[PDB]
Amino acid sequence: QGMNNKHATSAVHEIIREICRLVDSGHSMTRDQFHELSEQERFIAFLAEKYSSTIKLYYLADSSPLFEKDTSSFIENAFGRHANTVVMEDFGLKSNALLLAINICLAILREIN
Amino acid sequence: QGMNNKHATSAVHEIIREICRLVDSGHSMTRDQFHELSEQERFIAFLAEKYSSTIKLYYLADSSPLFEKDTSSFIENAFGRHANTVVMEDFGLKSNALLLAINICLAILREIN
Numbered sequence A, B: 001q002g003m004n005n006k007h008a009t010s011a012v013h014e015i016i017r018e019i020c021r022l023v024d025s026g027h028s029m030t031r032d033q034f035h036e037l038s039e040q041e042r043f044i045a046f047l048a049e050k051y052s053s054t055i056k057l058y059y060l061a062d063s064s065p066l067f068e069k070d071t072s073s074f075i076e077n078a079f080g081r082h083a084n085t086v087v088m089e090d091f092g093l094k095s096n097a098l099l100l101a102i103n104i105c106l107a108i109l110r111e112i113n
Helices: A005-024 A031-039 A043-050 A069-083 A097-112 B005-024 B031-039 B043-050 B069-083 B097-112
Strands: none
Touching: A005 A043, A005 A069, A005 A097, A005 B097, A031 A043, A031 A069, A031 A097, A043 A069, A069 A097, A097 B005, B005 B043, B005 B069, B005 B097, B031 B043, B031 B069, B031 B097, B043 B069, B069 B097
């Protein structure tokens, strides 16, 4: 409700960018882990932590001065909501659930905008 | 000027989706080919043709009833413009230029919206 839509939009663009980097380095996630993390509303936290050595999160790192709990909580919950209703095949995917996350990011952008 | 922004937005979401599918199947593009195709304003046509056996383009296939030349031309030109000013490293990438294309898609969405 007090979430900066402009902030939230940039944060989601940032997620897409960093997931693309993970994919560029050959990282992958199983659909099962992706759905579990999203349902537990902690997909982003998981990435931030697992890939903390390389991941660049100006918006979504809790140690960033740009971090806003409203934006991060909205995003984590949004993954939970969307991953509850879509699956890999809804976007013509099979293997790498990081790419399902990118599709869900676009659904979230629609919600924000 | 007569481009349906709503149409164009959905078309760009579609590009991101189909590129994600290409990446899921292990396809890649070199930065050199990506910059060449974009500069020649034919990156999307190239994908449509090369991957015509699997790619699903409801908006961007010229044989689709949803095809609109204004949207497709805007998008092709937009890739040309953006790929003229950014490079892989601007988005923390190195190898797969398909992922640079996804980042450029977000820049295009900003332009449309």
